[PDB]
């Protein structure tokens, strides 16, 4: 029996299997408005009792660092998301919206009035990394503006309002993108956060921002509708920490405490495998250490295959396994994993293009 097809109770959500659509930016949401193409894409991948997480979704006008990514901060966006959620729900799937602020991982071209992007720090991402521009060229990450505590409270409110908007659109819940060197990770990582106020210095202070964000969304929509994604060890956008395992455990402690205070568990903790990029034992150590420390559901992501996903669930390393790239090219990935059917190759060249069909909805199902 395939352990990926054991049912799982993710809080009040009864999942029929443990294969999850990982959140993936695809850049088809023209002008930050969800489009009908997204509805077709998510519908193709939805299964009865399966869990889907959307592409990262803007919480405010300053939260983007990619072209044509959806927002959920306007009523127009909420109206269009509702059409997509309705088609996914008609297939019996559960869907969460990932709330995403990129912080310093942006460019003047993506910011209102060409202003600098915001961060914990004035330190830019280094020139080892370049940003995808709307014309398909690559640009230079600029120096961000370091925000004060009033503005931090405004950003927390943007997460809270976006969570309420997601519920209004019919989403089952939201995921906080606290990973991958984006805004929240720019507060978490000691390689980035050079602040001397209450949001920097100590590990406890560096965890303040994520704690406040999670508390705000939990208060607004309930813990069982909130998932949290982190990546304490990741090679992405110069987001390093001197002690990744202690950073991860400090975040896990905060999430455990939020749950005890709220009297309810979060939907899940979602952790990226350190092997994933845009020793193996230290990486496996870290994943299992975080899972064992967290009082709740654990989703693993990053480089998983059918075999590795089966092993993760069978060995108790994770409750759910999210797949990215293979879900791009296999709309029926769940069925293919169930049948052990051969998988289709994916085309990286069309990961972030704008076409509503090509490289998006035209990967074939099984015959
Ligand atoms: C095209 C693409 C876009 C992605 N965008 C996001 C994103 O918006 N938010 C996020 O948390 N992770 C994002 N990721 C990481 C994925 O959620 C996932 O963790 C990763 O793809 C898993 O590894 P796999 O592709 O080997 O299955 C993205 C990955 C890809 C390939
Ligand atoms: C490498 C880790 O970063 C990611 O996967 C990502 N978003 O989180 C994108 C847009 O690629």
Residue numbers in the entry: 9 to 286, 297 to 385
From the paper:
The biocatalytic reduction of the oxime moiety to the corresponding amine group has only recently been found to be a promiscuous activity of ene-reductases transforming α-oximo β-keto esters. By studying the crystal structures of enzyme oxime complexes, analyzing molecular dynamics simulations, and investigating biocatalytic cascades and possible intermediates, we obtained evidence that the reaction proceeds via an imine intermediate and not via the hydroxylamine intermediate. To gain more insight into the reaction pathway, we determined the crystal structures of the two enzymes OPR3 and XenA in complex with the oxime substrates 1a–c, either by co-crystallization or by soaking. All the crystal structures obtained had a high resolution (1.9–1.35 Å) and showed clear electron density features for the oximes.
To assess if the introduced amino acid exchanges affected the overall structure and the binding of the oxime, we also crystallized the tyrosine variants in complex with selected oxime substrates. The protomers in the crystal structures of the tyrosine variants are perfectly superimposable with the ones of the wild-type enzymes, confirming that the exchanges did not lead to major structural alterations. Interestingly, the binding mode of the oxime substrates also did not change in most of the structures. Testing the tyrosine variants for oxime reduction showed that the exchange of the non-canonical tyrosine Y370 to phenylalanine in OPR3 led to significantly decreased product formation compared to the wild type (OPR3_Y370F). This is true for the transformation leading to pyrazine 3a and the cascade with the alcohol dehydrogenase ADH-A leading to the amino alcohol 4a. In comparison to the wild type, the non-canonical tyrosine variant Y370F of OPR3 showed a 4-fold decrease in both kred and Kd in the reductive half-reaction and a 3- and 2-fold decrease in kox and Kd in the oxidative half-reaction. It is clear that Y370 plays some role in the binding and in the reactivity with reduced nicotinamide adenine dinucleotide phosphate (NADPH) as well as with the oxime. The effect of the Y370F mutation on the oxidative half-reaction is a clear indication that this residue has a role in the catalytic mechanism.
